[PDB]
């Protein structure tokens, strides 16, 4: 687990053979990570859009571990001011908002 | 309630005598709403920052009802692509992330 929100909900993830920190972001549809090298095929995706779009690489069905929950999901790899776990992966780990 | 994350977690809020919709956004430190008229004193606040800052009006101790919970917190009033409930108000309602 239960994560309170007095601080930014930054968690450790395991991806592309690396440990990284990322923000559990319910405001984000997608997961975007900087400086990960993932294997295999990808397709470009345009994200953002206000003032222009940013092009990133979309990788599908990526194994990723978030707080020791091993799940599978789409990871966008590209420039992001901060690493973000979006709703697409939060559903996989069964993460909910509760009050 | 328990809110799953397959869709954007948009909720009804009651503020400044109006019903509004806003996104429960764990990636946002603060709460920013468009087109609400709040009474009394405020101070300017600079938010954002990437490419420039946005000036908004900061109102403190604002009564707001989020999804049936009456709470008190800081509301920033100004242009925002979408109305956002940030962590500052999620703590007040006792909202947590759980998996």
């Amino acid at each position: 687990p239960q994560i309170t929100l007095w601080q930014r909900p930054i968690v450790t993830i395991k991806i592309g053979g690396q440990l990284k920190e990322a923000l559990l972001n319910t405001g984000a549809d997608d997961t975007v990570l900087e400086e990960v090298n993932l294997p295999g095929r990808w397709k470009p995706k345009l994200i953002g859009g206000i003032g222009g779009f940013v092009k990133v690489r979309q990788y599908d069905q990526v194994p990723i571990e978030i707080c020791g929950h091993k799940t599978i999901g789409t990871v966008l790899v590209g420039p992001t001011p901060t690493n973000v776990i979006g709703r697409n992966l939060m559903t996989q780990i069964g993460c909910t908002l509760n009050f | 309630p328990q809110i799953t994350l397959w869709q954007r977690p948009i909720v009804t809020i009651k503020i400044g005598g109006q019903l509004k919709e806003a996104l429960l956004n764990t990636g946002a430190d603060d709460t920013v709403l468009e087109e609400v008229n709040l009474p009394g004193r405020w101070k300017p606040k600079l938010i954002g920052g990437i490419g420039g800052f946005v000036k908004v009006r900061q109102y403190d101790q604002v009564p707001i009802e989020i999804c049936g919970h009456k709470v008190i917190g800081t509301v920033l009033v100004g242009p925002t692509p979408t109305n956002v409930i940030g962590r500052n108000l999620m703590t007040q309602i006792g909202c947590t992330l759980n998996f």
Partner: peptide, 7 residues
């Protein structure tokens, strides 16, 4: 879309 708010 995907949405932050440093602050």
């Amino acid at each position: 879309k995907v949405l932050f708010l440093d602050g």
